[PDB]
Design an enzyme around this catalytic site. Structure first.
Site, mmCIF file in Angstrom:
data_model
loop_
_atom_site.group_PDB
_atom_site.id
_atom_site.type_symbol
_atom_site.label_atom_id
_atom_site.label_comp_id
_atom_site.label_asym_id
_atom_site.label_seq_id
_atom_site.Cartn_x
_atom_site.Cartn_y
_atom_site.Cartn_z
ATOM 1 N N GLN A 146 0.840 -1.186 0.000
ATOM 2 C CA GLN A 146 0.000 0.000 0.000
ATOM 3 C C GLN A 146 0.870 1.229 0.000
ATOM 4 O O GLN A 146 0.766 2.069 -0.891
ATOM 5 C CB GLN A 146 -0.901 0.068 1.229
ATOM 6 C CG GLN A 146 -1.600 1.404 1.346
ATOM 7 C CD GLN A 146 -2.526 1.483 2.527
ATOM 8 O OE1 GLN A 146 -2.079 1.531 3.676
ATOM 9 N NE2 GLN A 146 -3.826 1.497 2.261
ATOM 10 N N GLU A 196 -4.004 -6.346 -1.039
ATOM 11 C CA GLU A 196 -5.202 -5.731 -0.463
ATOM 12 C C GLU A 196 -5.720 -4.879 -1.605
ATOM 13 O O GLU A 196 -5.146 -3.844 -1.938
ATOM 14 C CB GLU A 196 -4.880 -4.838 0.736
ATOM 15 C CG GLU A 196 -6.088 -4.640 1.646
ATOM 16 C CD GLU A 196 -5.851 -3.658 2.774
ATOM 17 O OE1 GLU A 196 -6.585 -3.738 3.785
ATOM 18 O OE2 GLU A 196 -4.948 -2.805 2.644
ATOM 19 N N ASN A 236 4.644 11.825 1.190
ATOM 20 C CA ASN A 236 4.713 11.296 -0.162
ATOM 21 C C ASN A 236 5.147 12.369 -1.167
ATOM 22 O O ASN A 236 5.908 12.082 -2.096
ATOM 23 C CB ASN A 236 3.365 10.691 -0.576
ATOM 24 C CG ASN A 236 2.975 9.481 0.267
ATOM 25 O OD1 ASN A 236 3.782 8.577 0.505
ATOM 26 N ND2 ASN A 236 1.725 9.455 0.710
ATOM 27 N N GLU A 277 25.666 4.834 -12.769
ATOM 28 C CA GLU A 277 26.506 5.831 -12.106
ATOM 29 C C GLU A 277 26.381 5.724 -10.599
ATOM 30 O O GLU A 277 27.376 5.597 -9.886
ATOM 31 C CB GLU A 277 26.099 7.239 -12.523
ATOM 32 C CG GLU A 277 26.269 7.550 -13.978
ATOM 33 C CD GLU A 277 27.367 8.553 -14.225
ATOM 34 O OE1 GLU A 277 27.472 9.518 -13.436
ATOM 35 O OE2 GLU A 277 28.114 8.385 -15.216
#
Lengths: 412, 309, 426
Positions: free
Chosen positions: A10, A44, A201, A227
């Site tokens: 989630q 879920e 977030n 890199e």
């Protein structure tokens, strides 16, 4: 050239929706434009459904959205072995169907939440099945490892000592962003006691944009994914650097925005701005990849860094003369239209391997023992196709990760 | 370092040609070249030059006799744990292949007859002796040739091998095949095999050819040791890339006394560097008057090598 | 005579576009068009770089080797990109990983045969072959590894024809890659032992020379490339023009390499003045030698003033006095007797074409074989050890089927190469 991404759990999906948002936002591709280049896994349904119901609804193919109506279970075992297994094939199929369609790719940016069921377990075998199917690529997994004191799940460590040991021998570079240590930034460097998950977030959603997005984007000092791992990992352990961002100023309160390089770079090493409760309590850096973006003069950097190299109180490892990968991009950052991010014309997303995590791992390992010491929620895994082996033998695993992160430093 | 010279007798072809025999070996260590010469007026005269060597062998001398004086004394060195090298040097058709490989005017024949075989014979006998037996040594053999900077495994169908050097500068030829031998018969088989496979041009009417450098080695190994207990490298040199190797070879051998790279010297390098290492050079000479220029070249080269002594 | 260019890797490729961008105009060849040549002399010798098929389509005889499609698909989808016969494009859609080992042993080794195939189709073109031009960067996969292989094979197929190599040795100050010294040390190794003329260019020696010797404030890559391509045109193509005293790859080779290593040079162009203003025309000649022989202006990173020269080749190309040329060279050889090595009475190799760079009055390419380039392989070699010691990003090599003795090899080799070069500075 490209880099697929598998947002698992989630959380890895919420963060995914976020990082995925910031993207189009700075590429002029509204709700319905091109086609992503990743997938979404969860046991879920209701959560991936949020990507199926909410914003950025039609920007995905119901094919890169995997779900197992079944049960999530905040337990590694079940998610890795028992349940999580059933889906994996199908999961892989997309990262083999999406991996084909492209043109000479570079790797898969994986997004998971260490201490979960679908996030710890599952991935464990997803990254697992990748290291074998494409050993010839980059496996940079972007994790959100366990809040130092503000964990959620009761078992968390069980799930995180297990996702570490199983993924360790499979990842290339594991980026880490501490959920709690990001809150501090929201309290101390932006001011808000109202930080919705939807914010943290937006943040990683930022630091991440600095990794892939802009970097895979032309500039005055390009830095490929390879890199990283090269300039970032001194040793095969899927070493975990830390993500840090510089202009984390509030788009309302204070306004000194115009904070020339010389400033934003110094603002990376102060421990109160690193998306990780691993305050450089002693951890000697051993390699940093200073990714800059926006209006930056290479001398400004090849000076701002020089000043740092001689602050000493920032002690870099011994066996490392110079460990500063200067990555310069052009296009400045791109802040959400009206979230809470300042919106400067230059930023520094510096990530690095620091002997510091010697801590973070320690403190997370200890946790584990306490419970294992009493078997606590052990019957929940055993009854899910695991054994006294996998635990005890994954504990010993990390043990040599406490010695590893100790030996590669603290000594000359 | 020991340097010897061996004169081959005039062959039937030379004799029929009525070639004059220019060389004399009046003593065990004296070789004389009766160089023909003409003054400007074209007066004929002989400039007899004298050369001294540790051992000088006459046309009568057999391979066994030559072997006794050159290679034989080196075998113990390997058991001692040293590294020994024996080189056959000289002009084309001088007898280098005949001496090392076996008796043949074609340079290719009876393996048993040559120094590689004779040396092997002694290796088995010594290993058996009481001082050595405790050693519990295993004998291995390899045969390869160097052609234009390339190494080819004669034991493994001319397989091209790669040669690498570390920073340490120790060289290794990867892929070289070592074969276990427990009998002289075994070694003879490997010599036959390698010799057949040896490089050359089209089937010549007669004789072999030395476009390459031939190197047959005898290694002794307990379980490593100094990367093996001891090693003896017998080399059949090409007729005097070739020049560079020969120049390189000279400096390496002379370096041996005291302590412009080439493939041969690179592969052989460990054999020069160690303190416990000995070498023997045998200079082959063709007695014919026509070859006088070639011989002096060979002899002078030899003199410089021995000079290090 | 003839030659067949080779665009190894992206860089070597990107530059191909600039080397051919130029050269063509220096030969009146429009995209697919023919010879619009302002003159008639830019044609009697073209062959050196093209082939006759249609009658208006003289196609560049080069090779485009790369394991990253997008690249060649940028060079083939832009300007002059549509002049190369598709047969020239030897792509490797594989993962063009930035590993020397991935483009020399595992991935490139496959695409090789399908290259040599063409390098033969072009060699067996016609007339007589001279050598091959090779462009690439020693700081990547398709460049150092796969291109360094292309030659090791070429030099086995025609150890007669020459091999000029244009390498973009890893710039100091900042490395545009991370393993750089890995991909580099490994390719220089292959160079010191196959090609017999190497012209090392440094992205930052250029910037400098391009931001202070050309007040140019925004030196895009295209530029750097452009400047470089300017030198490689003066070298080859040029000498394939008339001249009071002309030379050709060999002369250049047989006058510049005292000892077989192959030795690397450092190219320098002549009129390098900023556009408008600077257009001083102070190009009588003492002005060109003034230029060419100064520190800055040497496409290399190192500074000549830091080490004697073994040979020098002022390949001028513009009507001048074999007297004011032959003369100048002298004073130059005496004002700096200090650094110019002595065991060579006349280090300098004066060369003199006639026709100059299309729009210019007088130019002169400089190809220096100075011992100064010691202080570069040193650099590279250092970076290696400092990271080799810890086997840094070594798993990306070994894991690709490599050897722990392979890296040892190269460093040493190339490391010794530093040694030798000093044997003359003294």
């Amino acid at each position: 050239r490209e880099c697929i991404s598998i947002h698992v759990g989630q959380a890895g999906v919420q963060i995914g929706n976020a990082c995925w948002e910031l993207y189009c936002l700075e590429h002029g591709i509204q709700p319905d434009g091109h086609v992503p280049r990743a997938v979404f896994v969860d046991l879920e349904p209701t959560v991936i459904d949020e990507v199926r119901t909410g914003t950025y609804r039609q920007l995905f193919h119901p094919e890169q959205l995997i779900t197992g109506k079944e049960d999530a279970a905040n337990n590694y075992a079940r998610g890795h072995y028992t349940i999580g297994k059933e889906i994996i094939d199908l999961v892989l199929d997309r990262i083999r169907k999406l991996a084909d369609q492209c043109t000479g790719l570079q790797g898969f940016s994986v997004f998971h939440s260490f201490g979960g069921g679908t996030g710890s377990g599952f991935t464990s075998l997803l990254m697992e099945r990748l290291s074998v199917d494409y050993g010839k690529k980059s496996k940079l997994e972007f994790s959100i490892y366990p809040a130092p004191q503000v964990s959620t799940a009761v078992v968390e460590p069980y799930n995180s000592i297990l996702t570490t040991h199983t993924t360790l021998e499979h990842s290339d570079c594991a980026f880490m962003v501490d959920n709690e240590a990001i809150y501090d930034i929201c309290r101390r460097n932006l001011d808000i006691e109202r930080p919705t998950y939807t914010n943290l977030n937006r943040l990683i959603g930022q630091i991440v944009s600095s990794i892939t997005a802009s970097l895979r984007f032309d500039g005055a000092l390009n830095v490929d994914l390879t890199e990283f791992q090269t300039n970032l990992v001194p040793y095969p352990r899927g070493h975990f650097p830390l993500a840090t961002y510089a202009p984390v100023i509030s788009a309302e309160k204070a306004y000194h925005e115009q904070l020339s390089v010389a400033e934003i770079t110094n603002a990376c090493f102060e421990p109160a701005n690193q998306m990780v409760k691993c305050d450089p309590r002693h951890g000697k850096y051993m390699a940093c990849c200073l990714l800059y973006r926006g209006d930056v003069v290479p001398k400004d950097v090849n000076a701002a860094i020089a000043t740092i190299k001689t602050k000493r109180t920032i002690q870099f490892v011994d066996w490392c003369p110079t460990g500063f990968k200067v990555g310069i991009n052009y296009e400045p950052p791109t802040v959400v239209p009206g979230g809470d991010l300042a919106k400067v014309q230059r930023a520094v997303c510096m990530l690095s391997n620091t002997t510091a995590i010697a801590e973070a791992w320690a403190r997370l390992d200890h946790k584990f023992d306490l419970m294992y010491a009493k078997r606590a929620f052990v019957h929940w895994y055993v009854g899910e196709g695991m054994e006294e082996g996998e635990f005890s033998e994954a504990r010993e695993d990390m043990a040599a990760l406490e010695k590893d992160y100790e030996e590669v430093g603290v000594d000359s | 370092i020991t340097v010897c010279v061996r004169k081959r007798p005039i062959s039937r072809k030379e004799v029929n040609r009525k070639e004059i025999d220019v060389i004399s070996v009046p003593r065990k260590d004296m070789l004389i070249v009766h160089e023909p010469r003409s003054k400007v007026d074209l007066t004929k005269f002989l400039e007899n030059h004298k050369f001294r060597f540790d051992y000088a062998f006459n046309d009568t001398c057999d391979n066994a006799m030559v072997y006794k004086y050159t290679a034989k004394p080196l075998v113990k060195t390997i058991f001692e744990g040293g590294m020994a090298t024996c080189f056959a040097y000289g002009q084309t058709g001088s007898g280098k292949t005949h001496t090392m490989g076996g008796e043949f005017n074609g340079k290719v024949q009876d393996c048993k007859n040559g120094i590689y075989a004779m040396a092997a014979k002694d290796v088995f006998v010594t290993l058996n002796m009481p001082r050595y037996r405790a050693m519990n040594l295993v004998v291995s053999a390899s045969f390869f040739e160097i052609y234009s900077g390339k190494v080819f495994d004669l034991l493994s169908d001319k397989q091209k091998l790669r040669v690498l050097e570390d920073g340490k500068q120790q060289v290794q030829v990867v892929g070289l095949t070592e074969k276990v031998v427990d009998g002289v018969e075994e070694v003879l088989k490997l010599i036959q095999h390698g010799n057949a496979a040896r490089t050359s041009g089209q089937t010549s009417a007669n004789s072999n050819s030395s476009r390459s450098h031939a190197v047959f080695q005898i290694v002794l190994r307990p379980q490593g040791s100094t990367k093996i207990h001891g090693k003896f490298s017998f080399i059949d040199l090409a007729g005097n890339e070739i020049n560079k190797s020969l120049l390189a070879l000279k400096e390496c051998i002379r370096a041996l006394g005291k302590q412009r790279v080439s493939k041969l010297t690179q592969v052989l390098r460990d054999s020069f560097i160690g303190e416990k290492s000995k070498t023997c050079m045998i200079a082959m000479i063709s007695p014919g008057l026509s070859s006088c220029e070639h011989t002096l070249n060979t002899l002078r080269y030899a003199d410089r090598v021995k000079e290090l002594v | 005579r003839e030659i067949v260019h080779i665009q190894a890797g992206q860089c070597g490729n990107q530059i191909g576009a600039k080397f051919w961008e130029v050269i063509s105009d220096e030969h009146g060849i429009d995209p697919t068009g023919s010879y619009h040549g302002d003159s008639d002399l830019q044609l009697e010798r073209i062959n050196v770089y093209y082939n006759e098929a249609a009658g208006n389509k003289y196609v560049p005889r080069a090779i485009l080797v790369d394991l990253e499609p997008g690249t060649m698909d940028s060079v083939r989808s832009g300007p002059f990109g549509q002049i190369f016969r598709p047969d020239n494009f030897v792509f490797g859609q594989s993962g063009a990983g930035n590993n020397w080992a991935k483009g020399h042993y595992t991935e490139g080794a496959e695409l090789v045969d399908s290259v040599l195939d063409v390098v033969r189709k072009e060699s067996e073109s016609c007339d007589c072959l001279q050598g091959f031009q090779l462009t690439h960067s020693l700081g990547g996969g398709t460049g150092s590894g796969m291109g360094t292989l292309l030659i090791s094979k070429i030099r086995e197929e025609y150890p007669d024809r020459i091999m000029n190599t244009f390498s973009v040795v890893p710039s100091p100050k900042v490395s545009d890659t991370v393993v750089e010294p890995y991909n580099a040390t490994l390719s220089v190794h292959q160079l010191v032992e196959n090609t017999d003329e190497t012209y090392c260019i440094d992205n930052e020696a250029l910037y400098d020379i391009c931001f202070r010797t050309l007040k140019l404030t925004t030196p895009t890559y295209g530029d750097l490339n452009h400047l470089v391509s300017a030198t490689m045109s003066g070298v080859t193509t040029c000498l394939r023009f008339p001249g009071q005293l002309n030379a050709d790859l060999r002369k250049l080779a047989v006058n510049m390499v005292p000892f077989p290593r192959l030795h690397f040079f450092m190219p320098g162009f002549a009129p390098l003045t900023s556009r408008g203003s600077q257009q001083y025309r102070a190009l009588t000649v003492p002005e060109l030698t003034q230029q060419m022989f100064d520190a800055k202006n040497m496409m290399a990173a190192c500074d000549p003033r830091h080490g004697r020269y073994l040979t020098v080749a002022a390949v001028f190309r513009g009507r001048m006095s074999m007297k004011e040329v032959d003369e100048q060279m002298l004073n130059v050889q005496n004002k700096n007797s200090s650094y110019f090595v002595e065991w060579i009475p006349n280090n300098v190799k004066t060369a003199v074409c006639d026709i100059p760079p299309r729009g210019l009055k007088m130019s002169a390419t400089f190809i220096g074989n100075s011992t100064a380039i010691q202080e570069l392989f040193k650099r590279i070699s250092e970076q290696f050890t400092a990271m080799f010691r810890r086997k840094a990003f070594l798993h990306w090599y070994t894991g690709e089927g490599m050897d722990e003795m392979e890296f040892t090899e190269a460093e040493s080799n190339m490391n010794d190469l530093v040694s030798e070069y000093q044997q003359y500075q003294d």
